[PDB]
Amino acid sequence: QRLSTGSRINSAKDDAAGLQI
Amino acid sequence: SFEPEIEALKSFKNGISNDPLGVLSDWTIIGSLRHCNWTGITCDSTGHVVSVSLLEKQLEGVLSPAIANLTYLQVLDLTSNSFTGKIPAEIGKLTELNQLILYLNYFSGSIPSGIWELKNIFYLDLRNNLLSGDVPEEICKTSSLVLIGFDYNNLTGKIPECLGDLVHLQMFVAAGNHLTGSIPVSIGTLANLTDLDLSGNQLTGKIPRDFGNLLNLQSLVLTENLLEGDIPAEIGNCSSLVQLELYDNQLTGKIPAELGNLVQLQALRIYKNKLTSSIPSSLFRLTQLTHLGLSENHLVGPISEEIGFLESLEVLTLHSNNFTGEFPQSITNLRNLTVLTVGFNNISGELPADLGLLTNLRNLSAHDNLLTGPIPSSISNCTGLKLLDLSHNQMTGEIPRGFGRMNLTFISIGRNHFTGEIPDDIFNCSNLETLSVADNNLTGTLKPLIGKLQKLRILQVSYNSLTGPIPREIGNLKDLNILYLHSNGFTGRIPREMSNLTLLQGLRMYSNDLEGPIPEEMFDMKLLSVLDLSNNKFSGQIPALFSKLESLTYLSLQGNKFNGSIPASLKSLSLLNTFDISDNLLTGTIPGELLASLKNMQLYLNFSNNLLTGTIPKELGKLEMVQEIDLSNNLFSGSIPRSLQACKNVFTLDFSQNNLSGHIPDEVFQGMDMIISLNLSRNSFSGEIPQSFGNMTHLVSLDLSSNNLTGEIPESLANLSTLKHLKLASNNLKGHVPESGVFKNINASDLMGNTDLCG
Amino acid sequence: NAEGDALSALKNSLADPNKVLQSWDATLVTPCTWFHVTCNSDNSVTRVDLGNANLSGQLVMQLGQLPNLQYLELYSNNITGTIPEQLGNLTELVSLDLYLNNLSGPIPSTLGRLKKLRFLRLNNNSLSGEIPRSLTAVLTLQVLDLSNNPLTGDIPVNGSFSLFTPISFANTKLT
Ligand SMILES: *[C@@H]1O[C@H](CO)[C@@H](O[C@@H]2O[C@H](CO)[C@@H](O)[C@H](O)[C@H]2NC(C)=O)[C@H](O)[C@H]1NC(C)=O
Ligand SMILES: *[C@@H]1O[C@H](CO)[C@@H](O)[C@H](O)[C@H]1NC(C)=O
Ligand SMILES: *[C@@H]1O[C@H](CO)[C@@H](O)[C@H](O)[C@H]1NC(C)=O
Ligand SMILES: *[C@@H]1O[C@H](CO)[C@@H](O)[C@H](O)[C@H]1NC(C)=O
Ligand SMILES: *[C@@H]1O[C@H](CO)[C@@H](O)[C@H](O)[C@H]1NC(C)=O
Ligand SMILES: *[C@@H]1O[C@H](CO)[C@@H](O)[C@H](O)[C@H]1NC(C)=O
Ligand SMILES: *[C@@H]1O[C@H](CO)[C@@H](O)[C@H](O)[C@H]1NC(C)=O
Ligand SMILES: *[C@@H]1O[C@H](CO)[C@@H](O)[C@H](O)[C@H]1NC(C)=O
């Protein structure tokens, strides 16, 4: 990704949730 | 247009060690006079080299300082190559340099000071390199700067506080570095600033309030830092903000209601923070939100039905909070929704019918909540659902059909009130790697269709009432690692096809009706770690072929009909932390070399309730680091081996209900300082009571009852603090019974009948 | 959780031919259902038993991320590298067994800040350096078997070592 187009929306993550067993 | 530039370019070519694509070969073949037609090279009207641009040409080697000898150079673009070494310090000499883009290379060392002296430079991209050192204060004086990438380097130190001077800045991104200290407040004075990414650093202190003054700001990314205090309400005044990422920080206090004023917002992620109170309703005024999550915070109160307004919402993480009250029934209003996680909260109520409405739903995590009611039948209509975790809730009813058409992977519905059978259509989804129904009321058989889902890694049907045999289809699973069917009504013989699971690391069949000869084939599993067969109808001798599983941390044959003597072959497994052979028909002596071949066993050795006869093997001394030993209720004959003075990790020791005789050795208990409970009760033990019992600080319950012990009671026990339950009872003891101690609240029963005791 | 992440870090630093750590799934809410991992009623990791798993690799700093860790058994493996000082950050840790490994370097002084420590066996290793005086401070120490790894610098009698029969040293190039 070029520096011109800037920081995109998906450049950061979503908080992942654990699995219960 | 003359020689000096040509020499600069040639001297740049040299120094490039590897050119596999053969790009620079062009330069060789075209010739030196036609050089303005060279690949990557472009000149101006007057014929001077201006732009050197080579991207993804896979060039290795170093950047020769000779580039400084191209005077009219404006743009140098090296993007995405293998260039190593340090950026040439003479680079300050260019002076016409517009954009220096070194992005995606191996460049190292400190950023050349020369760069900061350039008055013509706007676009500076150093992102993705090895550059170390710090951002100098000098950067504030180079005023032509607009876009500065520092992302993913080794840069350290603090962000220059004078950065607000860099007036033209539209973008500053330092993300993925070692920067420390706080965020310069002067940054909030850049009015043309659009994008700011400080994420993935050590930065501390509060977010500057004056950040509310940036009206062109679109992306604000502070994530994965040490930032403290609370989100400033001033942020509510940035109207151009499309994306706000505060996550993974120390931020505290309530979420500013003024955040509801940023209506251009798409992503708002404040998760993994200290934030408190309740979600301001104003947040539901952001209707362009796609990604939102509040998860991993201290937030309280309910989730308002007004989430139904968002409607562009894609991912929602509310998990790991204190949220309470009714479930957000209006969640079905967002049909773009893919991930929804409310897990780890106190949320109650029922899932909405027409939940099936969502369709796009991939992840549903409601786990660990107060939710009751049936799984909505409309869930049949979510065709994109890979993950469903409803586990640990109050939910009722029967598992619906339709899971066959969902294409799932993980299902944990366990720890609920669910009744009825296991729908057979549930086996029509072959991608399921995890099936856990454990701890419910589900009734029925386990049908051979189970064989249908080959991909499964873990299967838990435990703690239900299920019946019938175990289908041979079970063998097809292949990659199962955990199989737990325990605490059900399963009957019959263990199918030999279970030998076909070579990846299975644990097996719990315990508390069932299982019986018959354990299939020989089942001993061909070398990878099986834990095996619990306990509490079943199993009879006959313990197969020597049990030796064929040499890696076992856990083995329980307890509570069965097992015949004969402990097979010596069992010496083969030295990895056992827990060996429970207790409550069976086992006869004969304990094999010495089995007790020896278990050298380090860290937890539980229980032979209790058997017909075992003999002296207690001296090889029990070889057992060290063992916490519990229960030999109770057996025919064991002789005196206690002093050899076991060597196990100091013993907490509970039960020799009770046996034929053991002779004096209780003091020498053996000196070692067992750690003991918490000690049961010698109901034996032939004679002689005095060991004085080292007084040296036991962790002793709580001591039972010497029903013995031949002849001594005067040792006072040592009196003043001992941690002692709680003491049993003397039937015995012959003499003289004064100790006063101050557990003897204060003592029951007469514990001393009776002792014949003569003064008191 | 964080503890599951710590153990995941340990797992990434290790080669596992016996597939012992196959049971370890970082995506789980806790690593309490993981094999060779045992937690308490509050889900905090208590024991880790990796002994004789024929693993190979280096230890990790995140081993300090398990506050309730009591028994740590890595003994009898091919594991190399040093012993991270963050092992001192464990408050209540009853038994530390690194013995029968290729681990090298000094024994960190931080190993003396665990006052609940009973069993410390570093023996049969490559460890080289000086003995921390704080190992005389901890006083619990029912067993210290450390030997077979050349260290020297002295043999402290500073008084929690007053109780040791000295197989406890046994070719330390000691004194
Ligand atoms: C939604 O469920 C998916 C699995 O279906 C989760 O995905 C995994 O997350 C871990 C950790 O981020 C990754 O290592 C895996 O590769 C992911 N698997 C897939 C297929 O993506 C995901 O975490 C869940 N989403 C949320 C936000 O919890
Ligand atoms: C640039 O060109 C001059 C000759 O004009 C040469 O002496 C010098 O070595 C070149 N670059 C540098 C500073 O090394
Ligand atoms: C801010 O942006 C606009 C670009 O359209 C420009 O007119 C204005 O002068 C800029 N202010 C600066 C350079 O600080
Ligand atoms: C921007 O919002 C603040 C509250 O955060 C408000 O008081 C102020 O009036 C607004 N703008 C300015 C600087 O006038
Ligand atoms: C739910 O409430 C109970 C009782 O007040 C409390 O013990 C528990 O911490 C709460 N659960 C969550 C996830 O906050
Ligand atoms: C699935 O959707 C259709 C209409 O789109 C509806 O008739 C049906 O009831 C839904 N779910 C079920 C229960 O099959
Ligand atoms: C127990 O062992 C005996 C002798 O090996 C065997 O004959 C008998 O069938 C077993 N007991 C039962 C009732 O299964
Ligand atoms: C000791 O073991 C016997 C069984 O032999 C049991 O009945 C008794 O209650 C135990 N004593 C105590 C106080 O735990």
mmCIF file of C-alpha atoms and ligand atoms in Angstrom, chain B residues 4 65-66 68-69 90 93, ligand 2:
data_model
loop_
_atom_site.group_PDB
_atom_site.id
_atom_site.type_symbol
_atom_site.label_atom_id
_atom_site.label_comp_id
_atom_site.label_asym_id
_atom_site.label_seq_id
_atom_site.Cartn_x
_atom_site.Cartn_y
_atom_site.Cartn_z
ATOM 1 C CA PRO B 4 28.741 13.205 -14.214
ATOM 2 C CA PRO B 65 26.265 7.349 -2.297
ATOM 3 C CA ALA B 66 26.831 8.304 -5.946
ATOM 4 C CA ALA B 68 24.048 12.368 -4.456
ATOM 5 C CA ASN B 69 25.772 13.215 -7.741
ATOM 6 C CA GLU B 90 25.448 12.567 1.382
ATOM 7 C CA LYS B 93 23.049 17.189 -1.202
HETATM 8 C C1 LIG D 2 30.547 13.068 -7.351
HETATM 9 O O1 LIG D 2 31.302 13.572 -8.441
HETATM 10 C C2 LIG D 2 32.603 14.056 -8.159
HETATM 11 C C3 LIG D 2 33.286 14.481 -9.457
HETATM 12 O O2 LIG D 2 32.628 15.592 -10.023
HETATM 13 C C4 LIG D 2 33.448 12.985 -7.484
HETATM 14 O O3 LIG D 2 34.702 13.526 -7.127
HETATM 15 C C5 LIG D 2 32.756 12.441 -6.246
HETATM 16 O O4 LIG D 2 33.508 11.341 -5.785
HETATM 17 C C6 LIG D 2 31.319 12.013 -6.553
HETATM 18 N N1 LIG D 2 30.580 11.683 -5.340
HETATM 19 C C7 LIG D 2 31.121 11.608 -4.123
HETATM 20 C C8 LIG D 2 30.871 12.762 -3.195
HETATM 21 O O5 LIG D 2 31.790 10.647 -3.746
#
